[PDB]
Amino acid sequence: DPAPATTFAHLDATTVLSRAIAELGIYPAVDPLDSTSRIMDPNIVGSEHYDVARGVQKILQDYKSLQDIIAILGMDELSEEDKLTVSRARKIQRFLSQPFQVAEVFTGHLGKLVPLKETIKGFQQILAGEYDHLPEQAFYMVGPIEEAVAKADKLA
Amino acid sequence: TTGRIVAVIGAVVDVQFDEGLPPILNALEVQGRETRLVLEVAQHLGESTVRTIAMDGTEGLVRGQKVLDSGAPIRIPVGPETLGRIMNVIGEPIDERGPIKTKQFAAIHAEAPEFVEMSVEQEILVTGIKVVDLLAPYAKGGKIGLFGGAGVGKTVLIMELINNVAKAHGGYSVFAGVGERTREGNDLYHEMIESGVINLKDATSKVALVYGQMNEPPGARARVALTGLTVAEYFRDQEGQDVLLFIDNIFRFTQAGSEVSALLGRIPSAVGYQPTLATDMGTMQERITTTKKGSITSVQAIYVPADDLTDPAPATTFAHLDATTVLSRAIAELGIYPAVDPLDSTSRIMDPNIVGSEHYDVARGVQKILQDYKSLQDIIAILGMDELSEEDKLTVSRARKIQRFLSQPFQVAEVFTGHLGKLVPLKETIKGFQQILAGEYDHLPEQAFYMVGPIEEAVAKADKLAE
Amino acid sequence: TTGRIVAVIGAVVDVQFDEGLPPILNALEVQGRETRLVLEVAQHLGESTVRTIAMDGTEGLVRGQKVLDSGAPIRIPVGPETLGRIMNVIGEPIDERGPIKTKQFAAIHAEAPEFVEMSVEQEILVTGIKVVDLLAPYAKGGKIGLFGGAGVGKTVLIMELINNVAKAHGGYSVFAGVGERTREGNDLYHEMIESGVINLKDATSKVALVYGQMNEPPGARARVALTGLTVAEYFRDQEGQDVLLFIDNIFRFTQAGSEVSALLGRIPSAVGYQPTLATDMGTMQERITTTKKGSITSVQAIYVPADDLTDPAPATTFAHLDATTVLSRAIAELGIYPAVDPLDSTSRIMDPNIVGSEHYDVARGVQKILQDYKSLQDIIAILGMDELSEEDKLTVSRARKIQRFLSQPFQVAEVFTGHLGKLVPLKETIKGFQQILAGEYDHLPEQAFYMVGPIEEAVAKADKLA
Amino acid sequence: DLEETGRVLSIGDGIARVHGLRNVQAEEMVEFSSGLKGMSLNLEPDNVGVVVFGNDKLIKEGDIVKRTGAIVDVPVGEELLGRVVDALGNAIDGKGPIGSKARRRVGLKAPGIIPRISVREPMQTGIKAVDSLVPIGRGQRELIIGDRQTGKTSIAIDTIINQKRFNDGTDEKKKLYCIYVAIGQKRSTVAQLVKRLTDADAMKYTIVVSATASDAAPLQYLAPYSGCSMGEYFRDNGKHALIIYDDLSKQAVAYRQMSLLLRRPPGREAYPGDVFYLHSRLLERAAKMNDAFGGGSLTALPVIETQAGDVSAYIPTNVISITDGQIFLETELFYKGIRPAINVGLSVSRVGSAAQTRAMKQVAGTMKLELAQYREVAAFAQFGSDLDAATQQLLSRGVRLTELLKQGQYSPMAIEEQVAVIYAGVRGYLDKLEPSKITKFENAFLSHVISQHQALLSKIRTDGKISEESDAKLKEIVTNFLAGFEA
Amino acid sequence: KQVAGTMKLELAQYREVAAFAQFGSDLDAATQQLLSRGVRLTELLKQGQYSPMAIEEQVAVIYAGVRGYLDKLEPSKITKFENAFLSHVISQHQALLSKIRTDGKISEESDAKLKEIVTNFLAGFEA
Amino acid sequence: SSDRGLCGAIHSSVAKQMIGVG
Numbered sequence A: 001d002p003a004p005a006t007t008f009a010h011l012d013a014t015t016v017l018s019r020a021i022a023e024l025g026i027y028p029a030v031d032p033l034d035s036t037s038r039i040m041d042p043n044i045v046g047s048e049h050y051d052v053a054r055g056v057q058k059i060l061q062d063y064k065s066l067q068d069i070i071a072i073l074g075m076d077e078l079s080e081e082d083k084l085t086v087s088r089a090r091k092i093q094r095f096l097s098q099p100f101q102v103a104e105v106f107t108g109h110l111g112k113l114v115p116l117k118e119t120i121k122g123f124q125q126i127l128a129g130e131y132d133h134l135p136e137q138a139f140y141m142v143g144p145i146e147e148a149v150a151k152a153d154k155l156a
Numbered sequence B: 001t002t003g004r005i006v007a008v009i010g011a012v013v014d015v016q017f018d019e020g021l022p023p024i025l026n027a028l029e030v031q032g033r034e035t036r037l038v039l040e041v042a043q044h045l046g047e048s049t050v051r052t053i054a055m056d057g058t059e060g061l062v063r064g065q066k067v068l069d070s071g072a073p074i075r076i077p078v079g080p081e082t083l084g085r086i087m088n089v090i091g092e093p094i095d096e097r098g099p100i101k102t103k104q105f106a107a108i109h110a111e112a113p114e115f116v117e118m119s120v121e122q123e124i125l126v127t128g129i130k131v132v133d134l135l136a137p138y139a140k141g142g143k144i145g146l147f148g149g150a151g152v153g154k155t156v157l158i159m160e161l162i163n164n165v166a167k168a169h170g171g172y173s174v175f176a177g178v179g180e181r182t183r184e185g186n187d188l189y190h191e192m193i194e195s196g197v198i199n200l201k202d203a204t205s206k207v208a209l210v211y212g213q214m215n216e217p218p219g220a221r222a223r224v225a226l227t228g229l230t231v232a233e234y235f236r237d238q239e240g241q242d243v244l245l246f247i248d249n250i251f252r253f254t255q256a257g258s259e260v261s262a263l264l265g266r267i268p269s270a271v272g273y274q275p276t277l278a279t280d281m282g283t284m285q286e287r288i289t290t291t292k293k294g295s296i297t298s299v300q301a302i303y304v305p306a307d308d309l310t311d312p313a314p315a316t317t318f319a320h321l322d323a324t325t326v327l328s329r330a331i332a333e334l335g336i337y338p339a340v341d342p343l344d345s346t347s348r349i350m351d352p353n354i355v356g357s358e359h360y361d362v363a364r365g366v367q368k369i370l371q372d373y374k375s376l377q378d379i380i381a382i383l384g385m386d387e388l389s390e391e392d393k394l395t396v397s398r399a400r401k402i403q404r405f406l407s408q409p410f411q412v413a414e415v416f417t418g419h420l421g422k423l424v425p426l427k428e429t430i431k432g433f434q435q436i437l438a439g440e441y442d443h444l445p446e447q448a449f450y451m452v453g454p455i456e457e458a459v460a461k462a463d464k465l466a467e
Numbered sequence C: 001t002t003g004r005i006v007a008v009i010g011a012v013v014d015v016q017f018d019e020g021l022p023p024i025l026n027a028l029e030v031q032g033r034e035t036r037l038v039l040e041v042a043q044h045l046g047e048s049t050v051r052t053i054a055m056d057g058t059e060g061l062v063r064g065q066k067v068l069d070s071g072a073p074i075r076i077p078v079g080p081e082t083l084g085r086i087m088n089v090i091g092e093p094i095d096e097r098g099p100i101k102t103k104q105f106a107a108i109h110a111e112a113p114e115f116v117e118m119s120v121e122q123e124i125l126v127t128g129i130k131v132v133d134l135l136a137p138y139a140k141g142g143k144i145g146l147f148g149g150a151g152v153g154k155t156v157l158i159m160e161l162i163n164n165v166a167k168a169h170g171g172y173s174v175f176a177g178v179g180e181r182t183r184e185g186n187d188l189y190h191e192m193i194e195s196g197v198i199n200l201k202d203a204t205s206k207v208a209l210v211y212g213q214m215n216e217p218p219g220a221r222a223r224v225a226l227t228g229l230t231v232a233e234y235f236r237d238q239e240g241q242d243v244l245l246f247i248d249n250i251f252r253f254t255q256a257g258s259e260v261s262a263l264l265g266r267i268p269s270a271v272g273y274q275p276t277l278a279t280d281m282g283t284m285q286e287r288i289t290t291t292k293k294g295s296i297t298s299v300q301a302i303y304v305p306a307d308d309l310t311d312p313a314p315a316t317t318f319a320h321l322d323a324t325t326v327l328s329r330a331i332a333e334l335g336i337y338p339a340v341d342p343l344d345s346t347s348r349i350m351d352p353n354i355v356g357s358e359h360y361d362v363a364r365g366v367q368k369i370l371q372d373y374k375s376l377q378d379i380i381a382i383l384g385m386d387e388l389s390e391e392d393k394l395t396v397s398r399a400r401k402i403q404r405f406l407s408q409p410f411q412v413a414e415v416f417t418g419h420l421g422k423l424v425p426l427k428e429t430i431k432g433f434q435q436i437l438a439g440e441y442d443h444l445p446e447q448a449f450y451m452v453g454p455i456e457e458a459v460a461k462a463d464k465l466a
Numbered sequence D: 001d002l003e004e005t006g007r008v009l010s011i012g013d014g015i016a017r018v019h020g021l022r023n024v025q026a027e028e029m030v031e032f033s034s035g036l037k038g039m040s041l042n043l044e045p046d047n048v049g050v051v052v053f054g055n056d057k058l059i060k061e062g063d064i065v066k067r068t069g070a071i072v073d074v075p076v077g078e079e080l081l082g083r084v085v086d087a088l089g090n091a092i093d094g095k096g097p098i099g100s101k102a103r104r105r106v107g108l109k110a111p112g113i114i115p116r117i118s119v120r121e122p123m124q125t126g127i128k129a130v131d132s133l134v135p136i137g138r139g140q141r142e143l144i145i146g147d148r149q150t151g152k153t154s155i156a157i158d159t160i161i162n163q164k165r166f167n168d169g170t171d172e173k174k175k176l177y178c179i180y181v182a183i184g185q186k187r188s189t190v191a192q193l194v195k196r197l198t199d200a201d202a203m204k205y206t207i208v209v210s211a212t213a214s215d216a217a218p219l220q221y222l223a224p225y226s227g228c229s230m231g232e233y234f235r236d237n238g239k240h241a242l243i244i245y246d247d248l249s250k251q252a253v254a255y256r257q258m259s260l261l262l263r264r265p266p267g268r269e270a271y272p273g274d275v276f277y278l279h280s281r282l283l284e285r286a287a288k289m290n291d292a293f294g295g296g297s298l299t300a301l302p303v304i305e306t307q308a309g310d311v312s313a314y315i316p317t318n319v320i321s322i323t324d325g326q327i328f329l330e331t332e333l334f335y336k337g338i339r340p341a342i343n344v345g346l347s348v349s350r351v352g353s354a355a356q357t358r359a360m361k362q363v364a365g366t367m368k369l370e371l372a373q374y375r376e377v378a379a380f381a382q383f384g385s386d387l388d389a390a391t392q393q394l395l396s397r398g399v400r401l402t403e404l405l406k407q408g409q410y411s412p413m414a415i416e417e418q419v420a421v422i423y424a425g426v427r428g429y430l431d432k433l434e435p436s437k438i439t440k441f442e443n444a445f446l447s448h449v450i451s452q453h454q455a456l457l458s459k460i461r462t463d464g465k466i467s468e469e470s471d472a473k474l475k476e477i478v479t480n481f482l483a484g485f486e487a
Numbered sequence E: 001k002q003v004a005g006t007m008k009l010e011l012a013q014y015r016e017v018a019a020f021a022q023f024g025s026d027l028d029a030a031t032q033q034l035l036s037r038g039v040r041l042t043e044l045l046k047q048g049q050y051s052p053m054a055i056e057e058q059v060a061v062i063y064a065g066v067r068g069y070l071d072k073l074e075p076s077k078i079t080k081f082e083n084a085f086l087s088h089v090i091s092q093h094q095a096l097l098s099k100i101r102t103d104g105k106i107s108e109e110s111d112a113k114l115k116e117i118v119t120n121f122l123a124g125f126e127a
Numbered sequence F: 001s002s003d004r005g006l007c008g009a010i011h012s013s014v015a016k017q018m019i020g021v022g
């Protein structure tokens, strides 16, 4: 639409929210492949931050490309390599969600603030395959990665 | 009689005449310009004011500037003396080689040849291009159209046709650059000096050139096709000769008109076009024809806006042709060149009583296997190749090979392919495809058939791919 | 008074009057013509000039040609004398049987019955057709969407509704052919004559016919529905009847409105429809209703452009429908007549608060069993019939019996078939289907319920077979 | 005299704004001082908007325009037969003046509701797919529709060519005069058209009305009506006429040009609000007259070009809804080898059986059913090896009837030749024959029955159907032939 | 041109075949080679920002790919290879790059020198 | 298992557990 379309070029960082992401219960409903920042640059944020980000984005994009196949035929027709991208991506999607202090009435969780270093580490670790043993739901609506672990344990 | 400019909005100029009113289509001459500025009368507005479109830029024009009625439409030089020469919309030489010393001139507006002047003769014009020759062959004196969106291969294909057909043509050729790239005109000009079809030193030139490219304002692109056409019309009648007419790109005639349509006070028709789109095209296209007096083989590159063949412009053009070559971006995206859609290209002479039942039966066989493969594509693409009948996967492998055997390295395309260009005679094209259909090369791999000339080269390449 | 033509642009004519102006919606008679040329005032342009929409061709008209203001809208002959007659939009007979001798005339534009004039109650208008009355029943003064087309027994269903409404409710019918194809209007005419609902000899005619044919100007086609409705309004207002009004077809009413609107220079709305789409539809549909005096119940054939139910035309129409009768080509091929799809056809009044708990639960039970029967049909082609459970064998049996008991011979189709027609009362319809579900006729053969009226004839047919 | 004459105020794009002419009638033919005609489509308070029948260069501001007492009518009659004329009935074949003795207005009301009887008499196309599954009757309007280059004109040409077998005959009832209206086409395309009809010996009973791409918009607009009135002459005089409008898509475009430039309001796709009316009033003039009116008939085959299969676009929607049925052609059927490219699932004639003879009626019902049963299972084919014999049979019978509906161009068949061919398929004689061999089989089989069983073909015609005796005959002809075929 | 002259059409055929083979079903030696080559060139065409490459360095990198010398190197290693390879030829072989740049071509001598560099480097790299 | 796929996790399930049949 002309109005939003024209606004993009006025911004140094865009957060694009998506109704489809919201409807999946993912809040904040950020489209992690449509939101950009002019400082997402290895020379500004450092190569580690930059690499984890590009990594997360690649696994999410790879997941997205597999979704036509998944919707018709389902999980079962995927190679073992694809099933792993799907499972890691789905855990990453969930770990992108976060309980807001301001939205506590709606989440039913206590609002959380994750320091940058711990954000990088949590996703760095999911990408490294370190929690391929943990269930999806454990990554949903938590703060730091430690909370995901403790949530997995509590799922007995 | 003398008139005065009263309004200038873009290409559209209003001129008031106190005495005699110039009739519609008349060429007016703007006084006090460095270079000749022609205005063509479009409408009589009332109150002794005519509305005109300009044939060159209107910058510098002043309200009140004097304008003279020439007394006639735009008249251009026609005859042998236009051969080897480059003209613009208004018949001025643009090759810096001086005057075009013709005995006679012709108005660029003229009536279409009557129904009684029509010919029904149609014999095949072989090109050496596999997909064309096999599936949708050209006829001598016929109207040929090359449809395609942006960058799919219209011009390369038309340059290959000039290479394969015009170079060795006995009579005369006309090439009309219509709203296209100046770079391509310079390219073509120097390639024809090189090949001798244009000679700058003697009188052996066989090609007249007429150019009104996309650096020109719309009035010029709107008429420059008429200019080329008129040159060809002369060679057809006043010499009775076999004329080749090439136009790249005839859409630009229609686009030009759409550019000025609103300033001429028209309610837009669908998709932003002039309401007159079809009649405009009609009185133009009906002149591009073979008659009893002589033969024009016309090849017209036809731009397809937004890749959409239903766009009023290309859609209305189809009915004017005897053979249609349709280019596709989906096919070109595959590396298949020429990017001819073998299921969307047609010819009037694709008839067993004309090409013989052998040519016909193979052509229809080729299309059937491509249509069958197409009808399986989206299906097996998600449901598995192994779940197929042993004769289904035989058509799938054969169609995939035929798809590739339809591709061809063009002489004109050497800078794009890295392959030497190939010309394939008709019988060899028929034979080759006939053979793949009969199962004769199921042992050969797909890629052997990709980007080659005759079928023996598919065999040679198969040996080279082994080791 | 008398005005002069100042402009003619196709079917739009501008008339200038020297004294008082005809108000909008007035009919104007053009002078100096072979046949009548009515112009309907659409706007007051200022400067004593009105813009009109022509009810026929404007070929031959001169600027200056005299035009007589009739003083009112289009007024047409109304009453029992219009029955069995065919008229056009402006009230003229087009059946070549001479003048329509009515004492009354009525203006084709009238406002909807006022809020106080409304019935606060919803009643079934019993058709005596089993599928309709049981599963998707008609509402007194409501609107029904008829989905069908050719070959599905549509003309027979119409002719029978005309018949059954006269027989059960003492109500007359009106058929309004909006965009009637001339060929099909003739055929329809003779089919009615052949079936009896029109009678040229005596005066038993049950339907009045109003044709707005395809080759007529937009205005004519846009107004015929009103003309038809006006005829029908006579029988409600003056004779207290539960009337039937057929509109064939409602989409063409909408499209004529779209055309007229385009001709008057009005900017088109979404999907190119008239900006007044909803009001055009509203001011006509609201006339179809139950008043304190009687009711008009309308059956309206619906074309769904591009098979899009969200298209402005059907969307707007659906706002007014109280039920749908869906005629199915699949159903007809199974020999089931009427070819009503029992699961696709719906009704707003299928509600125990309206039709009663017993009518409701039997219809639901019928729907449930026909829904269940389909679920097992995949297992039918695979496992065969003798692999089902004793409960599931019994549902297949009962559902197959229900399907056939939904078929009904029509009186209007006696000539074609020889079979005697049936009009089943509501209580016998409910009773019949009530008992098949209970398992009171499981012992009976399946073909005994086919082409039968009441459940007693299902028993008499079963006894008759060897 | 500003009552009988006027002067041109402004002229452009085929529209002359004329001052005066106070007495002109709406749609009256006026004349410019150069001799060009015009039609008075807009009568406005201070000008007449005149639509120009020729090139604008010949009209200037201040030119005198005259009412002539002219009337928009066309030459009419049997002297038009074998002739090529323009929109107005002028000869363009160059064989001198039409010898016309009667004239008829181009704009006239269609027969009302009463002068008609049901459509009953077969209008025989000679195309197996059509006569069997989409049958056409005299008085019907049946739409031929599809994207470009799908075979639309061919359906019409073969229909015209077919009538020779009746016109050479001595039964008058069965004869059919043909009118082909070319709208917006190129002259050389029309030439090839008349050449084909001439070689087929079809021109002697055909009138060709042609308003080609360079003819002014109004001529292209009038042409169908002109051709129509020439057919009404036959219809109104106890005779039968066929008219092809090729095409109505182009006619609409031409009228749109005019309405837009007359500054009438644009609607969907920029078409005006009277374009449905334009076509509806043309097509209603096809009719089957009752015996009181001579019993004549006019059958219309309008052609419509769709864009990328969009039957829900504006003009297609109009003409689809106006007509009595549609023959839908498809590109993908065409290249699959299904030619004529008729979609049998979608095509429909609402007249139907009423327009078939008992012989065809018989075999066609079984074919319709078995093709419909085929269509349901059609997708189980290429992805089916482990099918039950019941659905294996439906597929086999289906692919084989599909082959029998294929037909060459320019060779329409007699109804009894058609039933003989369909008989072979519907009775199961070709079930074991390989699909690829069916077309060869039919040609050969038909050549045989025509050569050696003229009396059997004579019988199926005389009897009106296939009797037990004809059935027996066919059984033994087919079986032995098929045996010989697979030898 | 010498190295990239057929590559565009080749990459277009590779992408088509990569899609058609998307379901891992027994492929002939021809298409399996096209796939192997295709995936590898794709890796060579990746590039960071702010370090545009001199033509001769582009040529040497592409050369490695189009001549098949990397057909067995694991695709995920191609980038690490290119930078390693490139820094080697920049310091050690300024003479070869110089000649390619100056002559604007790969002579038969330069071709031989290049093959020797990449094959032996790649082996060292793959230890 | 078998040659034929498109049957859920039949083939993958035994392979995870794992001369073969199918």
Ligand SMILES: Nc1ncnc2c1ncn2[C@@H]1O[C@H](COP(=O)(O)OP(=O)(O)NP(=O)(O)O)[C@@H](O)[C@H]1O
Binding pocket: B319, B347, B348, B350, D146, D147, D148, D149, D150, D151, D152, D153, D154, D155, D339, D340, D341, D407, D408, D409
């Ligand atoms: N039964 C048939 N068998 C083989 N070829 C056919 C058949 N019918 C038509 N054709 C050919 O198919 C092409 C298209 O036929 P045509 O009758 O021109 O279709 P159309 O839709 O009228 N084309 P256009 O008006 O140019 O868009 C022509 O080359 C015909 O000769």
Ligand SMILES: Nc1ncnc2c1ncn2[C@@H]1O[C@H](COP(=O)(O)OP(=O)(O)O)[C@@H](O)[C@H]1O
Binding pocket: B148, B149, B150, B151, B152, B153, B154, B155, B156, B157, B337, B338, B339, B410, B413, B416, B417
């Ligand atoms: N026959 C061909 N062989 C190889 N490449 C081609 C061919 N035709 C086109 N191409 C590629 O596509 C480009 C666009 O072709 P061109 O003919 O200029 O497009 P247009 O259809 O816009 O005239 C060419 O410059 C070339 O790179």
Ligand SMILES: [Mg+2]
Binding pocket: B154, B155, B156, B180, B248
């Ligand atoms: Mg080009």
Ligand SMILES: [Mg+2]
Binding pocket: D152, D153, D154
């Ligand atoms: Mg055609």
